[PDB]
């Protein structure tokens, strides 16, 4: 299980936001992680990753990872989910299943500028 917070975020144009994911598993490690955004009004989520306004942080020791988005605009609104990557040498079925899990999501609303 992957615990994603906050569940919902409202921000003004120009601000920043940060979303956290923590892997609640004492066995499996956190190798890296990924982020996806579903636009308002659609079903399909597409990758977001480190670069430019997007700043990713992975903390393997805490089994957490975070996405910061700077200089927000209305175009950043949507539902964001994280997905962990937990690597292993030989096959481990527990950790294999963790690699298919997503966070519960964060619904982001960025209000227009005035």
């Amino acid at each position: 299980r992957v615990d994603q917070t906050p569940q919902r975020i409202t921000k003004e144009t120009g601000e920043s936001l940060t979303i956290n994911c923590v892997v609640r598993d004492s066995r499996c490690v956190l190798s890296t992680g990924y982020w996806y955004r579903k636009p308002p009004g659609s079903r399909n989520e597409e990758s977001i990753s480190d670069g430019g306004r997007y700043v990713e942080t992975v903390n393997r020791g805490s089994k957490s990872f975070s996405l910061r988005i700077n200089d927000l605009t209305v175009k950043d609104s949507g539902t964001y989910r994280c997905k962990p990557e937990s690597r292993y040498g030989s096959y481990d079925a527990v950790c294999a299943a963790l690699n298919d899990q997503y966070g519960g999501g964060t619904v982001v609303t960025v209000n227009a500028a005035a």
Binding site: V29, R87, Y88, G89, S90, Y91, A96
Partner: protein, 129 residues
Amino acid sequence: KVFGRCELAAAMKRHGLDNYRGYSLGNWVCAAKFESNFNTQATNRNTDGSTDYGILQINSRWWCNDGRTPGSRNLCNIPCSALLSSDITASVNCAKKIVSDGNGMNAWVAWRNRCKGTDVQAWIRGCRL
């Protein structure tokens, strides 16, 4: 090819695994025993569409390309066939990457389950090294 224990110890020492990333030679011999029973041609298919290859049972979701594994990376930048050789060079070079990937030898389930917390030095007892 199925290796002898001491034969494999000798080969792994020559390949630089004694104390690699802190793991004395017997760790690696013991890992190979319980992953593959020293069989360089060991392969095991897994429910996620991946396969484990070679003497250290390296997984195709992460480390090598077998052309049939969903959602796979090829972090060692090798074909999985290279891991089934009678010469262990490919498997060792990939093992060195795996053990440096952030989990130590806990990356191998068989090491975690059968070597960690045991007298692994026993696995090189009697070996001319």
